[PDB]
Structure 1
Amino acid sequence: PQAKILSQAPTELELQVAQAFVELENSSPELKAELRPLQFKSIREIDVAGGKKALAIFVPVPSLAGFHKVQTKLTRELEKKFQDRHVIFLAERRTLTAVHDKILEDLVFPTEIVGKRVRYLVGGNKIQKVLLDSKDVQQIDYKLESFQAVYNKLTGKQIVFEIPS
């Protein structure tokens, strides 16, 4: 679990999840049982408007359907070492805008969205807003800026999020 699941190790931040793979292994009855088919490939570093930053970890999608329930369990044991940090568990794939909304809904799969919005304003320009989900929203309000900041770093287009309530 140190230098085998890493996929081009020698840059910095994947060594930090290499050791974060290690203590995640020795909870052997259930935690390393689901840890078998994973393979993480890369790190991209994201800055937000605050002094804190955001990290993203990427998968080549061999087993993302099994990795979906892995993702929600892996959350609560990761900020106990990545305190004052946020991590998002993403991927990359090779009409292009119709591709683009797929990586959005894997980004927002915890409390997946239900609606999408744009407006064409009187200055001739464009704004666009995302309608979210209202189940256990007391963390996303502190971190919807984080899913804001990953995608303009990914693409450049400026997004808005707003919860129904």
Structure 2
Amino acid sequence: ALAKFHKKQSLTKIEEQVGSALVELQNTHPDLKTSLESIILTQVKEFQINKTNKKAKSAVLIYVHFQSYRVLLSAARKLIIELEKKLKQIVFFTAQRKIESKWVKEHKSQQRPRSRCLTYVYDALLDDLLLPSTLIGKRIRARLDGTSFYRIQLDQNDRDFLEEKLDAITHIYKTVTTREVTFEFKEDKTFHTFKK
């Protein structure tokens, strides 16, 4: 539907499927009705995960308007499950973040809130992708020359949902951001006082 979009002009074959696909789920499943009623879309981008295997395995990332970001996270799990079943493609939800300029300030009486800065915006997606579960440890490495590798620590109990998307994420990030992102699984680090 052009309904579930903000620009409301024209959609792309991908964006279109996503629209009806969404409208589908709120009619089909009674539970996602409430949440999906709310959800609006900003834009959707498709990315090809090209591996040396000459295999074409694509997935698509969808930009949920910030207004519905709360809601999007509220049912995030179930939503992505159905969208992947109903589109046979890998699905990722992000927030539509607007980045502010560093030196291009123009409104004398306007300060650039850190909330919308490049470090913080680009760092956002990573949380968004692995979505269902947020990371435990994040790190940076400086290869001699000057590369920066982000080996990120992911929870063990989530090996399911995250192991698969794992390659897509890497590839979407390298495209949007510019950051190489390798992951590493570590058993969760429960630190409490076991007391028998």
* TM-score (norm: length of structure 1): 0.86
Give me the whole-angstrom Cα distance separating, in 1, the residues matched to 2:48 and 2:63: 17
Off by >6 Å, runs of 4+ in structure 1:
none
Unaligned residue ranges in structure 2 (runs of 5+): 99-116, 188-196
User: Cα distance, 1:153 vs. partner?
Assistant: 0.7
Relative contact order (alpha carbons < 8 A, sep ≥ 6): 1 or 2 greater?
Answer: 1
Match for residue 60 of structure 1 among 58, 65, 81: 65
Partner of 1:74: 79
Q: Percent identity?
A: 32
Partner of 1:3: 2
Deviations 1:120-163 (A, max 9, x none): 23444432211111113123222201110111110222111111
Partner of 2:102: none
Partner of 2:148: 126
Greater fraction helix: 2
**Letter of the 1:111 counterpart:** S
The CA RMSD over aligned residues, in Å, is 2.0
**SS of 1:78's equivalent?**
helix
Partner of 1:15: 16
Partner of 1:31: 32
Assess if the C-alpha contact under 8 Å between 1:111 and 1:134 holds in 2. no
**Letter of the 1:145 counterpart:** D
**SS of 2:159's equivalent?**
coil
Unaligned residue ranges in structure 1 (runs of 5+): none
User: Cα distance, 1:28 vs. partner?
Assistant: 6.1
User: Cα distance, 1:53 vs. partner?
Assistant: 1.0
* TM-score (norm: length of structure 2): 0.74
Partner of 2:173: 151
Partner of 2:139: 117
Give me the whole-angstrom Cα distance separating, in 2, the residues matched to 1:132 and 1:71: 18
CA 1:74–1:123 in structure 2 vs 1: closer, same or farther (change >3 Å)? Answer: same
Match for residue 93 of structure 1 among 90, 93, 97: 97
Give me the whole-angstrom Cα distance separating, in 1, the residues matched to 2:96 and 2:11: 20
User: Cα distance, 1:30 vs. partner?
Assistant: 2.6
Partner of 1:47: 48
**SS of 1:34's equivalent?**
helix
